């Protein structure tokens, strides 16, 4: 171990001694008597022009770039877990392994939560083996979990209406066309009621329809499905006060 560490230290020293004299800045400087280290030809012959190839500061290709930092980080961090473990890096985030280290990925400032949205929707697409439009169709009608159904065209429409006509003053002015509009439809405009949510709210619950509608709105039967206040508040995203 000590001999391999000494070999690695002297390899780094020889590389530093080679590259620190082949600097393109230190060529045309007057009366700085610096010779190259007499192994520059050997370095360029072993590694094909690496000492011949110096890069601009602030580049993607640089050894002090965030791409180099990320490369060293992933190379040293990809071994904390066994490969079959579900907490392994490539298993939990296969996107981060195949990231192309380019200047566009380095400098193109995209907003976060767009990456989160693309990652979640790509994982849902890879899970359910469908397209993005099919994922939105299934998410517009999913009733099993809380905070869902999510009708994305309906949300786009109601946010467009809320941006254009805030507080619904056109409804108050134009009463003869307000006659044609339904009060529950205007409720669905002013606050979020998806069409699937309206179907959930409007259906009646008989003792006959009980076990079927419990499957349709929860999945599992056998009423003890929450067993605790914490699971209920976590399923519906409620506080203890709201619960």
């Amino acid at each position: 171990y000590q001999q391999a560490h000494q070999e690695s230290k002297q390899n780094k020293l020889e590389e530093l001694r080679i590259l620190s004299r082949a600097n393109p800045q230190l060529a045309n400087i007057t009366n700085l008597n610096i010779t190259p280290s007499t192994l520059n030809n050997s370095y360029n012959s072993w590694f094909y022009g690496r000492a011949h190839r110096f890069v601009k500061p602030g580049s993607i290709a640089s050894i002090f770039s965030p791409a180099a930092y990320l490369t060293e980080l992933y190379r040293e961090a990809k071994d904390f877990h066994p490969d079959n473990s579900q907490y392994h890096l490539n298993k939990r985030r296969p996107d981060i392994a195949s990231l192309a280290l380019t200047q566009n990925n380095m400098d193109e400032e995209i907003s976060t939560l767009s990456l989160s949205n693309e990652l979640l929707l790509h994982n849902i697409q890879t899970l359910e083996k469908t397209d993005y439009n099919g994922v939105m169709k299934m998410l517009s009608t999913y009733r099993q979990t809380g905070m869902t159904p999510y009708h994305l065209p309906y949300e786009s429409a109601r946010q467009a209406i809320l941006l254009q006509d805030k507080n619904l003053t056109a409804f108050s002015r134009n009463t003869d066309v307000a006659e044609l509009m339904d009060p529950t439809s205007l409720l669905a405009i002013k606050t979020d009621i998806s069409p699937e949510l309206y179907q959930i709210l409007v259906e009646e619950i008989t003792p006959e329809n009980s076990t079927e509608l419990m499957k349709k709105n929860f999945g599992t039967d056998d009423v003890l499905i929450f067993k605790s206040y914490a699971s209920l508040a976590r399923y519906y995203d409620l506080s203890y006060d709201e619960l």
Binding site: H81, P82, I110, S116, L139, S156, A160, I161, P195, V202
Partner: protein
Amino acid sequence: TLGITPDGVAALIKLKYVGEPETPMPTFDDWQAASTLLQAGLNSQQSDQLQAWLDEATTTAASAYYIKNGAPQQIKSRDELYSYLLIDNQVSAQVKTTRVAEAIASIQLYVNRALNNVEGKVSKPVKTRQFFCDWETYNRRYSTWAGVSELAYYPENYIDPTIRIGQTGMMNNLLQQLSQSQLNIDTVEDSFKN
């Protein structure tokens, strides 16, 4: 006041929730057509506002769906989903971060969670490399890592002529003798003779 045609207004009213019978239920494509009809009637400010709001709604839809359907069984909250996926799904859409910085933050979060053994089974022999012995001081952030690597490659940037690890007592006494606001040639030559 909606910025569309009265035929578009009639198409919106035809998406009534409860109305006349024998009209069919509004299809998802019908809702998408009404959505792009209202969506084409906005300027760029309202379009960016609507887009940010739709992203901030679809994240809390899709994260709950991913927690329910496809996830390891330990994940039960959005914070646990963040702790798994290493990307924050609760950040509002005003925050911007490039892809390499997101990957850097994700791997740094994974390392800081694996070092405290919060995960399943951390491989203890990998934990004691030199890169992780220097994790707490140098390798945790890009700025200190790049500073250490620059101190390796170009030490000329970091040498000051005043302080140095290992300078002698005569050097320190010279520095005490030399640290004034006024330095004459006679003063510095007497200090050099001393």
